[PDB]
Amino acid sequence: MNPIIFIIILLTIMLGTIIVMISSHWLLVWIGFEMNMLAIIPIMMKNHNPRATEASTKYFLTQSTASMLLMMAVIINLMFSGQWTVMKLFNPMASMLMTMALAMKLGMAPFHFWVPEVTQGIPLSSGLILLTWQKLAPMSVLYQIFPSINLNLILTLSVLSILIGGWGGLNQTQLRKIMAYSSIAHMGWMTAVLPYNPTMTLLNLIIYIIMTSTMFTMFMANSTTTTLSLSHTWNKTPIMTVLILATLLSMGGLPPLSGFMPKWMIIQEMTKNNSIILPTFMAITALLNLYFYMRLTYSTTLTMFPSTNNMKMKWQFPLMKKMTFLPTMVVLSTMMLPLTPMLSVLE
Amino acid sequence: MSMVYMNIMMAFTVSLVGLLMYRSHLMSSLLCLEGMMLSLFVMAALTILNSHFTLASMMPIILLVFAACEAALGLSLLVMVSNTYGTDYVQNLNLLQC
Amino acid sequence: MMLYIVFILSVIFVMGFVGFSSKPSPIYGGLGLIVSGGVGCGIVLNFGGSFLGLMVFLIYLGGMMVVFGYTTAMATEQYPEIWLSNKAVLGAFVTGLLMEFFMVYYVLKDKEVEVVFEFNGLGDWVIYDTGDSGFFSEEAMGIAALYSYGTWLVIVTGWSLLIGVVVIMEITRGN
Amino acid sequence: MMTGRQGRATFQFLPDEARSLPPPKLTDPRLAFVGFLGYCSGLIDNAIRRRPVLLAGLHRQLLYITSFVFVGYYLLKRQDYMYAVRDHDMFSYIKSHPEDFPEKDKKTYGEVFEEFHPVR
Amino acid sequence: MNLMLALLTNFTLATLLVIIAFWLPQLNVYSEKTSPYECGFDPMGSARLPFSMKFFLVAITFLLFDLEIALLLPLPWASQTANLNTMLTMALFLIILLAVSLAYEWTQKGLEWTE
Amino acid sequence: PFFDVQKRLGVDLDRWMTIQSAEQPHKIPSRCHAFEKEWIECAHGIGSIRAEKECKIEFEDFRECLLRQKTMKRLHAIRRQREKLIKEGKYTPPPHHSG
Amino acid sequence: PGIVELPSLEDLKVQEVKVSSSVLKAAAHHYGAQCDKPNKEFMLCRWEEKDPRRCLEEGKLVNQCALEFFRQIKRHCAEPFTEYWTCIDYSGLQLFRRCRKQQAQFDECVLDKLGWVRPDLGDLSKVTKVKTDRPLPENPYHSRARPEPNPEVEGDLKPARHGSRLFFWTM
Amino acid sequence: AKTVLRQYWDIPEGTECHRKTYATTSIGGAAGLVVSAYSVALKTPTSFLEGVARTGRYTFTAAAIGAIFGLTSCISAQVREKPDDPLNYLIGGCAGGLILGARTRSYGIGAAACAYMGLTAALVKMGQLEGWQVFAEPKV
Numbered sequence A: 001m002n003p004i005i006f007i008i009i010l011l012t013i014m015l016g017t018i019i020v021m022i023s024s025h026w027l028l029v030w031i032g033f034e035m036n037m038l039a040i041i042p043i044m045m046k047n048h049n050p051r052a053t054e055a056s057t058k059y060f061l062t063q064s065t066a067s068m069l070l071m072m073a074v075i076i077n078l079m080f081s082g083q084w085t086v087m088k089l090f091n092p093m094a095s096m097l098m099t100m101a102l103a104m105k106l107g108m109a110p111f112h113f114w115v116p117e118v119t120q121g122i123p124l125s126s127g128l129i130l131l132t133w134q135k136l137a138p139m140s141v142l143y144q145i146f147p148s149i150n151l152n153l154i155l156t157l158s159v160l161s162i163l164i165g166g167w168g169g170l171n172q173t174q175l176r177k178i179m180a181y182s183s184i185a186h187m188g189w190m191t192a193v194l195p196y197n198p199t200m201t202l203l204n205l206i207i208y209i210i211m212t213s214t215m216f217t218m219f220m221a222n223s224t225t226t227t228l229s230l231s232h233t234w235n236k237t238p239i240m241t242v243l244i245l246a247t248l249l250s251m252g253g254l255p256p257l258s259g260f261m262p263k264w265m266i267i268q269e270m271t272k273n274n275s276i277i278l279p280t281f282m283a284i285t286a287l288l289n290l291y292f293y294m295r296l297t298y299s300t301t302l303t304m305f306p307s308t309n310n311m312k313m314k315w316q317f318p319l320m321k322k323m324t325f326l327p328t329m330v331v332l333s334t335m336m337l338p339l340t341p342m343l344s345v346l347e
Numbered sequence B: 001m002s003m004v005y006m007n008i009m010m011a012f013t014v015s016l017v018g019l020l021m022y023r024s025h026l027m028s029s030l031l032c033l034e035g036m037m038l039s040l041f042v043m044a045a046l047t048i049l050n051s052h053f054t055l056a057s058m059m060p061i062i063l064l065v066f067a068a069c070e071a072a073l074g075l076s077l078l079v080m081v082s083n084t085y086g087t088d089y090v091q092n093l094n095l096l097q098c
Numbered sequence C: 001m002m003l004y005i006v007f008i009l010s011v012i013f014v015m016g017f018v019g020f021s022s023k024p025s026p027i028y029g030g031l032g033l034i035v036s037g038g039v040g041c042g043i044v045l046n047f048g049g050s051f052l053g054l055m056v057f058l059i060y061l062g063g064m065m066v067v068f069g070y071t072t073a074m075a076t077e078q079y080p081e082i083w084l085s086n087k088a089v090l091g092a093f094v095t096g097l098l099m100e101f102f103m104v105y106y107v108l109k110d111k112e113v114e115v116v117f118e119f120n121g122l123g124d125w126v127i128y129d130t131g132d133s134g135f136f137s138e139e140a141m142g143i144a145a146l147y148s149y150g151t152w153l154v155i156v157t158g159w160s161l162l163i164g165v166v167v168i169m170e171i172t173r174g175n
Numbered sequence D: 001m002m003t004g005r006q007g008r009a010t011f012q013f014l015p016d017e018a019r020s021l022p023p024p025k026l027t028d029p030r031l032a033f034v035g036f037l038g039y040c041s042g043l044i045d046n047a048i049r050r051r052p053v054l055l056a057g058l059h060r061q062l063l064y065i066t067s068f069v070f071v072g073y074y075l076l077k078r079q080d081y082m083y084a085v086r087d088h089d090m091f092s093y094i095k096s097h098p099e100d101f102p103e104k105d106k107k108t109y110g111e112v113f114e115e116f117h118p119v120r
Numbered sequence E: 001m002n003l004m005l006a007l008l009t010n011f012t013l014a015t016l017l018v019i020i021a022f023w024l025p026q027l028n029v030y031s032e033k034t035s036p037y038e039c040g041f042d043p044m045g046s047a048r049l050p051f052s053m054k055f056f057l058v059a060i061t062f063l064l065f066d067l068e069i070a071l072l073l074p075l076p077w078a079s080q081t082a083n084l085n086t087m088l089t090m091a092l093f094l095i096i097l098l099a100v101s102l103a104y105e106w107t108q109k110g111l112e113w114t115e
Numbered sequence F: 001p002f003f004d005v006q007k008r009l010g011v012d013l014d015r016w017m018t019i020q021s022a023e024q025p026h027k028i029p030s031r032c033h034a035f036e037k038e039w040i041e042c043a044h045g046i047g048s049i050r051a052e053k054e055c056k057i058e059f060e061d062f063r064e065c066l067l068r069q070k071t072m073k074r075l076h077a078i079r080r081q082r083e084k085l086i087k088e089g090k091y092t093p094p095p096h097h098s099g
Numbered sequence G: 001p002g003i004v005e006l007p008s009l010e011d012l013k014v015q016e017v018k019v020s021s022s023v024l025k026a027a028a029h030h031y032g033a034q035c036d037k038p039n040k041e042f043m044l045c046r047w048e049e050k051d052p053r054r055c056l057e058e059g060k061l062v063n064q065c066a067l068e069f070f071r072q073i074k075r076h077c078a079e080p081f082t083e084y085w086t087c088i089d090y091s092g093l094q095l096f097r098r099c100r101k102q103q104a105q106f107d108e109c110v111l112d113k114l115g116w117v118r119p120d121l122g123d124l125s126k127v128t129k130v131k132t133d134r135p136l137p138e139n140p141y142h143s144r145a146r147p148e149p150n151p152e153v154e155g156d157l158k159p160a161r162h163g164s165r166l167f168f169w170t171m
Numbered sequence H: 001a002k003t004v005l006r007q008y009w010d011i012p013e014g015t016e017c018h019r020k021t022y023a024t025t026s027i028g029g030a031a032g033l034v035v036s037a038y039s040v041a042l043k044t045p046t047s048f049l050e051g052v053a054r055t056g057r058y059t060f061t062a063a064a065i066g067a068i069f070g071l072t073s074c075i076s077a078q079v080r081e082k083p084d085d086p087l088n089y090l091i092g093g094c095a096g097g098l099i100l101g102a103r104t105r106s107y108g109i110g111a112a113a114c115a116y117m118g119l120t121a122a123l124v125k126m127g128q129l130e131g132w133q134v135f136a137e138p139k140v
């Protein structure tokens, strides 16, 4: 692909998302998603192989269906309020369709089947956009319509996401499928605290993006896409295995690492609202996530898997990958708990 | 909510149920997406024309503009699916496992 | 009665949808969407929008003409399926019409029906406005404001159509 | 919960009313920790690219420390402003609704009866 | 009423002519008479087989440009506004971007039919 | 909006089409202009929590104008009663209601 | 809630102006020059009162003045006017362009026998001012009392008491 | 589901066991139909009757579990004259677990189901008495 065309298509993806965040009119919000899907698909088809074609097609079919439901919600909201403002919806049926449309876009359970497959079928760089940047626009809308969202619907999707994400990640050896099911589980935490304190939804999203972007950057550095491919990293870049250990432990929510902050703050807000059974269930179910992160540390950093002879040839060359912001991201993804009160800037 | 809104909203539901129940052809499902856009256009045009919401009269046109982009985008993917398997069957799109 | 022309057109509008929603050969599905587009133009045209009705019909006539060419190239088989050749297609076709019949039967008998929303069967004419406009078409004045009021809409749609051409070439390049 | 606060300063990093609050001291412990995180980023940058960790590129290490401290200073000003605003609203609301926050009648433990539970 | 009666008359006349065509003449139908025409020899395959479209890319582009006529046709009414400076700017901007799309596809060999 | 770039920059990107009582071409009014204006002015600056209960009268009239649910029910009863009387020969329609 | 108040059929009784649309369009320019004050009075009432029930009396003076306008044409300009509006009535669009010769004959009769000067181009579209003793409506929308605003929060902005007070944090 | 639950909780404990058994059997049966739908949708049956057979297998397992819970938890609260006692639900929950074992033809699943379904039923009853909220309305 022409480098200029890649840059233009990349900026169109951002423009679609930015239109959704600055739009106060529902029509412009819908235009943002349509522009975002129009530009994302060519980046999925970049390598032009059958798996990338299937991933793009499954992604297009799911996103297109969600945008239809979102437009139905907008029009129904128009019939019952006579205005297009991006605020609380004025009809229960409009809220359900918009909530479900935003759930399909996010890949929440039970609308999750595409996330594991689309991520596997596209390169690591495209997958990073799929699991970090594509979550900003739908989360922007949920942040503004949460007063009208049915509590049972949103909490049901959150609980199913935490369960399916944890279970699905146990039976996986592909890193892109592991990161895909991890993403679904984390969506549950963002939307579970949404009815109670939307600020903590932003905190978990920001921390999830930083940690997720760190993992893909380190997988991109070594061109590793499988557990066993990542198991050779200790024999090429020993430092990279320590950074993967610290980040994976952070993603598992273990203190004193950064990734414990979003769980800690989400439990606080839910317990203030006398929600005790759900935070306890969510925290315990999250141990499923920590298990298949621990399984990656074992085969990556804490043990030394068998190597191959040709690995000795890789010792004579440096890492030429850009690895942009990796030294900064890995630090922010591991040592930020002492700065937790800085979550107030998000308010 | 006149009796016309019933049929228009039923048309959307029929096209939605049609899109969620694939038979074999990817092209058959693409028609259901274009059918759903038609229902939304008609439903939006009716509400706007009936309430004399003058400035909203351009919204249905802007709704067709982005329906064509999606329709063209869906056709472009259908070309590449056909070039890889010789048909537009959706059962061939199963190399990626959940 | 001609007082129910809008309702009668909306019944055909649904029947056309059941035509392509049952998913026969896309050749016949394309025909169904043309019928719905034609009657959909009629329905919109009877609420005071002639440009909108004629425009959507115009856009979907060209839309299904490209789909027709793509059906003979990539969505064709030896025995294209009709609404009678397949039990799955026939089953979904008969089901759609039966639900349309029951909804039409109940609304015209009870003058009401409650499915998610509450619908009224008095006739679509009871909600029309009793005042006349001036020397212009309100729908035409609203659509013409896209260039004086909709500066932001023109830019995003204009950019979207531009990128749309760039994207389809990228997707179909194959190398 | 403070998204729609009456303060008509929308999409501003630091509203002008935030200039009434003391700035963070340059020796603030929170600002020192942020600066330390910059130093760790400098060392990790050297290690992933296989350079002498402590010595290589002192020019680049200083820019890591400065960049972190610079951004950290403004995030601390906004952090302290948001907490100052939180207390301002809380005290104003309590003043505007005295009936909801009455002064409880004071009692002494010589007057209040507390059940005694033997440990035997 | 007039338009509907005009349409009914045109398609009623068309239908009655077809009906006369099939019921007036003397018919002698047999298998060879109704076989498909392929210049005298039996067709080698089914006419329902795939037929490659070499102008598929131009056909997709027609969908995008056919939507510019919807955006451009309101121009005669748009010229009646009091905001002529804004209207003329966005009219030319919209047409120019339509032209840049044509230029991009033309230069990138997008309008050339596949071999 | 999540980020309010419009309000700070002073640029009106999409606010001009959000409500039907805003400025329209040639000052063409919407059918429910008065009802929308009243509901918007009643519920200005008081938040949706309060407006949901303190401006309930204006919002119910606004919804009545938009969808005409109560008017159509009232017309249905009158029309249904008239047929019952006529079906049992108990009411003669006047001339101006027939021709 | 409440009973819609309507005028009686006797309050709506008035002598109608039974002349076709071609008659009105032929005399429109002179009609708008002579009957301006009762016309503009009634048209101010509708836009201020926003209720047709509050402007019935003004609406009758529009009819009364229009009749007197045509009676004066019927006394002096009966024949030229008939030819003028017959020629406007012939066209499907009731165009003025096709009846200039007949318009001139109608314009000169009124000018001599009545002193009526045709308004120039743009005159009848002017926004004019009208003097009226009818009081300005105070609550034309019948609005209720607007809810009291939330108690505004104002004062000096002091530092957060003991910092963030987030669990164990001292700052 | 809100309708059935309100019907179940309106009947006082240990009374009208015929009605409470109807309520619980409805809840279990509905759960077995929701499982059958996804199973049929995601694991396509080889034939129509093979899929109707699967639907009847899951729907009967869930209906039997629901029926035995309400019956066993209602007579227990009737014999003991102790309505507001989680022990009644513990007995009912374990009985439902045993029925799951019989349908699965596994002693191990019978023991595990009895232990965890027994605890869950007891916890459900405690939450009804104390006022525990699973989906709590936002308050602060």
Ligand SMILES: CCCCCCCCCCCCCCCCCC(=O)OC[C@H](COP(=O)([O-])OCC[N+](C)(C)C)OC(=O)CCCCCCCCCCCCCCCCC
Residues within 6 Å of the ligand: A277, A280, A281, A284, H107, H108, H109, H111, H112, H113, H115, H116
């Ligand atoms: C809000 C908090 C949320 C908490 C969430 C908690 C999630 C955990 C729930 C997991 C339940 C999974 C149950 C699986 C059952 C599988 C059974 C099976 O397949 O057969 C296995 C086996 C039969 O398999 P087998 O016949 O093939 O042989 C097994 C041996 N090997 C492996 C060699 C083949 O049967 C069992 O052993 C099951 C034991 C039944 C007894 C269970 C009692 C548990 C009671 C709780 C623990 C007691 C301590 C706590 C006391 C509390 C006092 C108040």
Ligand SMILES: CCCCCCCCCCCC(=O)OC[C@H](COP(=O)(O)OCC[N+](C)(C)C)OC(=O)CCCCCCCCCCC
Residues within 6 Å of the ligand: H068, H072, H095, H098, H099, H100, H101, H102, H103, H104, H105, H106, H107, H108, H109, H110, H111, H112, H114, H115
């Ligand atoms: C009409 C009103 C009826 C009222 C009935 C009252 C309730 C009684 C229900 C009985 C159901 C039944 O029959 O249980 C029977 C089943 C038996 O196992 P199975 O799978 O059938 O073995 C079939 C094996 N084959 C396939 C080879 C034939 O139990 C069980 O699995 C329990 C066995 C393990 C003991 C668990 C107790 C210890 C763990 C608990 C710790 C707290």
